[PDB]
Amino acid sequence: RTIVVTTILESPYVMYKKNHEQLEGNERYEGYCVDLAYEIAKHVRIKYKLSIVGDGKYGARDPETKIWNGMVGELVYGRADIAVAPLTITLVREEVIDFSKPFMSLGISIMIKKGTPIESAEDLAKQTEIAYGTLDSGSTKEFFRRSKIAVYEKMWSYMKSAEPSVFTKTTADGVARVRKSKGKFAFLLESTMNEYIEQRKPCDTMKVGGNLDSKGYGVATPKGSALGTPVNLAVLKLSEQGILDKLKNKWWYDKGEC
Amino acid sequence: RTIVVTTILESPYVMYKKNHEQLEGNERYEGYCVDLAYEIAKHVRIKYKLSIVGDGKYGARDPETKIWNGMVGELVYGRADIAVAPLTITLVREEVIDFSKPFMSLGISIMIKKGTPIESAEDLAKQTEIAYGTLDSGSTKEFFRRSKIAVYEKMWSYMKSAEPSVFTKTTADGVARVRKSKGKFAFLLESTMNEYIEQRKPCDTMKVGGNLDSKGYGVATPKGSALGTPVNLAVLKLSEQGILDKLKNKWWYDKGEC
Ligand SMILES: COc1ccc(C(=O)N2CCCC2=O)cc1
Ligand SMILES: N[C@@H](CCC(=O)O)C(=O)O
Ligand SMILES: N[C@@H](CCC(=O)O)C(=O)O
Ligand SMILES: [Zn+2]
Ligand SMILES: [Zn+2]
Ligand SMILES: [Zn+2]
Ligand SMILES: [Zn+2]
């Protein structure tokens, strides 16, 4: 009767509460996806337990073993019933799991330390002084690997061979590298994460240029799961009631520091 | 073997070609949804015929007879196999038809004649000199009818009782009323239509303020249709290949006149 909700520690979607080490179960966490899971479970009338994905990854398929990792693998292998996380709806994932209609819009974007002389992907592509990278095992890395657009093909050729590695294990590690690199590293990440970090102390980063694509996050369920339909209607209802909007303002802008 | 694709004459999604009266069948039409239908049919490997919906409506359910009109009714009553049109994904529609993941993002927006002293919905709500309305039988009208947000509730109370009527039979009729009214009528319509008109001669309108909501258009199929799955993957593929982007630029901005 208690369903397992896989999710990932990524600010401001799921974060440890201030005193989390004194708390237990769902009470350990807060953020946009913690609130979304609560609202969804309320409408679908299920009890649930949040479970941070062990490997800390969104989900990709190993080309060798063909095994899915991350939250996607938790659904595929039957270890979680739903994922409520900033999980990008992509074709390769839709082949193996189901997604709700999207609860948030986003695009890939460029994060720079303020003052870096870069305004566009073209600007990064044509130079070599400023290194740049992306998160491992997620949809941004796959966007670059799969693109047939000249500028992004050039960026992928550079990142794939860069030494030392430009692929980070977590978003926070990429942000930290931008902040510590005196303008010499830029990070490619989703506009939602980029806009959140831009509003947080020390206010030394910014999003530059427009987004490189336009896509959405959805709530995911194992393929053919009976929960898929009610979850989808719940997301649509929350959207129409203005709740998704209220949550975005709560977690991004209400508390902005910059 | 030839499937019926319902659609609607709405610029720049489907428009008559210059010499349409000398042409037949699918060749009569051009625009973003004509291109999208072609790309989808190519991936799903179907032959198809475009059919402009007879009543010229998107789709709503009559509260009395309970009958669906517009493109939604064509799918519900079995007269069309797919709708490829700027058809908004909504909860009440998802209860009776299926939708692909969204091919375009949009929100409700305000269209004014340039120079009108209005910058926000709040600005319209608190005054009465400038009338304002929306399209009949679509999702924008339903947004206002259903909102529990104070400002939009006030706008709905005004529009519902306005005399003469502020609800238009087509988008073009609303645009024409804005243009002819010397600043005394504003039109509530989707950001996509608003941004297209803003780029067309006589360049006398503009979008003002941010969008009131955030939602998407999807390709629709009758509930439980076998075409639903392949169409959805086709839309995701076109999105990832940058084709939806290319089409948006082709139909909105490439030809901009303002
Ligand atoms: C919050 O509303 C939305 C979030 C995401 C999406 C989406 O998935 N897509 C696909 C193509 C372009 C785009 O934005 C559409 C609407
Ligand atoms: N949302 C992405 C993770 C972040 C990224 O790849 O930039 C995914 O679902 O894979
Ligand atoms: N896209 C809308 C029509 C336009 C509007 O209502 O503003 C619909 O699907 O109903
Ligand atoms: Zn701690
Ligand atoms: Zn609720
Ligand atoms: Zn004509
Ligand atoms: Zn194609």
Side-chain angles (χ1 to χ4, degrees):
Chain A
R1 300 311 304 164
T2 299
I3 66 139
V4 175
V5 173
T6 189
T7 189
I8 188 164
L9 292 157
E10 184 74 84
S11 301
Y13 306 92
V14 180
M15 304 180 283
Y16 282 128
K17 282 210 287 243
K18 181 195 84 164
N19 50 340
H20 67 106
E21 297 180 347
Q22 296 181 300
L23 304 172
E24 283 180 4
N26 295 349
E27 293 310 318
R28 292 169 289 178
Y29 309 110
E30 62 176 352
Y32 178 105
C33 283
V34 177
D35 287 347
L36 181 63
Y38 172 84
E39 294 289 345
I40 294 165
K42 174 174 292 202
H43 282 279
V44 177
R45 304 173 164 176
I46 52 167
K47 294 172 317 281
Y48 67 101
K49 174 97 183 295
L50 297 173
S51 166
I52 306 305
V53 62
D55 70 4
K57 299 174 167 299
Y58 283 84
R61 189 181 66 147
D62 179 294
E64 188 177 337
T65 72
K66 295 283 183 98
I67 297 185
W68 288 91
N69 62 29
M71 297 180 279
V72 179
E74 295 299 294
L75 297 170
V76 168
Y77 302 113
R79 293 188 290 272
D81 300 290
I82 182 161
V84 175
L87 188 64
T88 301
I89 296 169
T90 69
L91 175 49
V92 298
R93 294 172 175 166
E94 187 74 276
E95 296 184 320
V96 300
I97 56 174
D98 286 336
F99 281 100
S100 76
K101 294 300 187 296
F103 64 84
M104 192 171 294
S105 309
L106 67 299
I108 291 166
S109 67
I110 298 172
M111 172 187 289
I112 52 163
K113 195 180 170 73
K114 283 171 172 182
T116 297
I118 290 293
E119 307 183 1
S120 76
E122 282 76 16
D123 286 353
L124 288 166
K126 69 193 205 205
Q127 62 76 66
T128 42
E129 191 163 311
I130 293 161
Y132 52 89
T134 74
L135 182 72
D136 243 358
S137 300
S139 57
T140 299
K141 182 173 190 199
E142 177 83 355
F143 174 89
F144 285 96
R145 172 195 288 125
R146 301 301 175 199
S147 190
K148 305 312 197 173
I149 295 168
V151 54
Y152 308 140
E153 274 173 329
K154 182 167 202 174
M155 292 167 75
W156 176 241
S157 195
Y158 156 74
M159 302 189 282
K160 200 181 27 177
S161 283
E163 197 68 32
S165 181
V166 296
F167 304 115
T168 60
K169 93 167 297 173
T170 68
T171 299
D173 289 344
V175 172
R177 185 164 167 179
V178 169
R179 290 177 161 152
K180 284 165 196 158
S181 298
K182 310 194 182 63
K184 303 297 182 185
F185 180 78
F187 194 55
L188 291 151
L189 76 175
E190 291 163 338
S191 63
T192 43
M193 285 82 156
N194 197 353
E195 285 163 1
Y196 174 74
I197 291 143
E198 189 169 50
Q199 306 265 331
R200 304 297 289 179
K201 290 184 191 317
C203 311
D204 56 354
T205 63
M206 52 180 283
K207 170 155 63 60
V208 297
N211 289 351
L212 286 53
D213 64 359
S214 294
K215 56 203 179 182
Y217 300 144
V219 178
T221 46
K223 199 146 269 292
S225 165
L227 269 182
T229 297
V231 164
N232 185 50
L233 300 168
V235 173
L236 289 172
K237 179 158 278 316
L238 294 165
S239 167
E240 284 173 16
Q241 288 180 167
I243 299 298
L244 304 181
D245 289 345
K246 170 174 287 77
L247 296 175
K248 181 64 145 30
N249 286 149
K250 167 175 183 192
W251 290 107
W252 267 252
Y253 305 114
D254 281 4
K255 31 180 256 203
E257 297 167 338
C258 306
Chain B
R1 300 311 304 164
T2 299
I3 66 139
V4 175
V5 173
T6 189
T7 189
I8 188 164
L9 292 157
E10 184 74 84
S11 301
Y13 306 92
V14 180
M15 304 180 283
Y16 282 128
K17 282 210 287 243
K18 181 195 84 164
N19 50 340
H20 67 106
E21 297 180 347
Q22 296 181 300
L23 304 172
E24 283 180 4
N26 295 349
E27 293 310 318
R28 292 169 289 178
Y29 309 110
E30 62 176 352
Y32 178 105
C33 283
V34 177
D35 287 347
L36 181 63
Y38 172 84
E39 294 289 345
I40 294 165
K42 174 174 292 202
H43 282 279
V44 177
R45 304 173 164 176
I46 52 167
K47 294 172 317 281
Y48 67 101
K49 174 97 183 295
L50 297 173
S51 166
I52 306 305
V53 62
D55 70 4
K57 299 174 167 299
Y58 283 84
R61 189 181 66 147
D62 179 294
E64 188 177 337
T65 72
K66 295 283 183 98
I67 297 185
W68 288 91
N69 62 29
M71 297 180 279
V72 179
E74 295 299 294
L75 297 170
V76 168
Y77 302 113
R79 293 188 290 272
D81 300 290
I82 182 161
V84 175
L87 188 64
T88 301
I89 296 169
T90 69
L91 175 49
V92 298
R93 294 172 175 166
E94 187 74 276
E95 296 184 320
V96 300
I97 56 174
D98 286 336
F99 281 100
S100 76
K101 294 300 187 296
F103 64 84
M104 192 171 294
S105 309
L106 67 299
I108 291 166
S109 67
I110 298 172
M111 172 187 289
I112 52 163
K113 195 180 170 73
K114 283 171 172 182
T116 297
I118 290 293
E119 307 183 1
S120 76
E122 282 76 16
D123 286 353
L124 288 166
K126 69 193 205 205
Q127 62 76 66
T128 42
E129 191 163 311
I130 293 161
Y132 52 89
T134 74
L135 182 72
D136 243 358
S137 300
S139 57
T140 299
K141 182 173 190 199
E142 177 83 355
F143 174 89
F144 285 96
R145 172 195 288 125
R146 301 301 175 199
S147 190
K148 305 312 197 173
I149 295 168
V151 54
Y152 308 140
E153 274 173 329
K154 182 167 202 174
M155 292 167 75
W156 176 241
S157 195
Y158 156 74
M159 302 189 282
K160 200 181 27 177
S161 283
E163 197 68 32
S165 181
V166 296
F167 304 115
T168 60
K169 93 167 297 173
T170 68
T171 299
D173 289 344
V175 172
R177 185 164 167 179
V178 169
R179 290 177 161 152
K180 284 165 196 158
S181 298
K182 310 194 182 63
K184 303 297 182 185
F185 180 78
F187 194 55
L188 291 151
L189 76 175
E190 291 163 338
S191 63
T192 43
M193 285 82 156
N194 197 353
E195 285 163 1
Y196 174 74
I197 291 143
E198 189 169 50
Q199 306 265 331
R200 304 297 289 179
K201 290 184 191 317
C203 311
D204 56 354
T205 63
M206 52 180 283
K207 170 155 63 60
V208 297
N211 289 351
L212 286 53
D213 64 359
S214 294
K215 56 203 179 182
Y217 300 144
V219 178
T221 46
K223 199 146 269 292
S225 165
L227 269 182
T229 297
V231 164
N232 185 50
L233 300 168
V235 173
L236 289 172
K237 179 158 278 316
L238 294 165
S239 167
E240 284 173 16
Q241 288 180 167
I243 299 298
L244 304 181
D245 289 345
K246 170 174 287 77
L247 296 175
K248 181 64 145 30
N249 286 149
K250 167 175 183 192
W251 290 107
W252 267 252
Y253 305 114
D254 281 4
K255 31 180 256 203
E257 297 167 338
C258 306

